[PDB]
Design a protein around this ligand. Structure first.
Ligand SMILES: [Cl-]
Ligand SMILES: [Cl-]
Ligand SMILES: [Cl-]
Ligand SMILES: [Cl-]
Ligand SMILES: [Mg+2]
Ligand SMILES: [Mg+2]
Length: 292
């Protein structure tokens, strides 16, 4: 069975007046591997991947502001909020060079950080990452009505805030295998209080779909252009049918992105880490020393 435990000691750092939680395991020095979750997850998402990497490399996995075990400031939780807190987290830990391992909004954060700090990114492993979705036509049908409703005034907050639809609905609907109740309870814990679900609602409203919001579309286009022109080593995991990165997109990217390896994980929708963590972890571990 895929592991349900979270056997990592909590670490905390004060960031912009707020405490942020992170995992910090493996060697205490050397290039760290920075794992960035997205919506509506936490460092828990990486629990079965980190043990493959920690034998060789320091592993750092923060909980984004307002998520996981991190503090809950009264923010609007726009992408720019997350940018500010993650930038300040990285500086608070004194990180210099990093390897990024990124997913969903963690990928938007990671790629955006890399474009702005290109000399400090030694490699990027990514999966089910955020790219511009030019039309609803390209958003897979099985999840389209949901995300459209998430992005609709009043309806979206009833679903995500009042009814916890991101946790109880979208999350398990984006894993091919069934999540267990222990796993669901780990994902539920930060969000037992409805008001605390603001990040979960703002995130889908930030997705670059059909040209809006235009500032996020621009930001994401900018880092995708950066990624097409960067020689940084890249490792792209993909599943079938996928969500953000369908198989045909993964194959196009394998050709268009420089120095890119693609790994097929088999069945997968969005949270690929919950369907095939062993292959993702073992392949990252095999790939890291090649960043040499
Ligand atoms: Cl596992
Ligand atoms: Cl546990
Ligand atoms: Cl609203
Ligand atoms: Cl398959
Ligand atoms: Mg404070
Ligand atoms: Mg809207």
């Amino acid at each position: 069975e895929i592991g349900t435990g979270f056997p990592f000691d909590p670490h905390y750092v004060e960031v912009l007046g707020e405490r942020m939680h992170y995992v910090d395991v493996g060697p205490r020095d050397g290039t760290p591997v920075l794992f960035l979750h997205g919506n509506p997850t936490s460092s828990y998402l990486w629990r079965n991947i980190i043990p493959h990497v920690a034998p060789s490399h320091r592993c750092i996995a923060p909980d984004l502001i307002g998520m996981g075990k991190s503090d809950k400031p009264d923010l609007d939780y726009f992408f720019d909020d997350h940018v500010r807190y993650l930038d300040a987290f990285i500086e608070a830990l004194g990180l210099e060079e990093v390897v990024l391992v990124i997913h969903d909004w963690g990928s938007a954060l990671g790629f955006h950080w890399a474009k702005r700090n290109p000399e400090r990114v030694k490699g990027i492993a990514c999966m089910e990452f955020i790219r511009p979705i030019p039309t609803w036509d390209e958003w897979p049908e099985f999840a389209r009505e949901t995300f459209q409703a998430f992005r609709t005034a009043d309806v979206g907050r009833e679903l995500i805030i009042d009814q916890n639809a991101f946790i109880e609905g979208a999350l398990p609907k984006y894993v091919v295998r069934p999540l267990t109740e222990v796993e669901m309870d780990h994902y539920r814990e930060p969000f037992l209080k409805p008001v605390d679900r603001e990040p979960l609602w703002r995130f889908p409203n930030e997705l670059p779909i059909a040209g809006e919001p235009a500032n996020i579309v621009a930001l994401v286009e900018a880092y995708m252009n950066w990624l097409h022109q960067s020689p940084v080593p890249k490792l792209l995991f993909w599943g079938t049918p996928g969500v953000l990165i369908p198989p045909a997109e993964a194959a196009r990217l394998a050709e268009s992105l420089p120095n890119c390896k693609t790994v097929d994980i088999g069945p997968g929708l969005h949270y690929l880490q919950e369907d095939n963590p062993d292959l993702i972890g073992s392949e990252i571990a095999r790939w890291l020393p090649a960043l040499h």
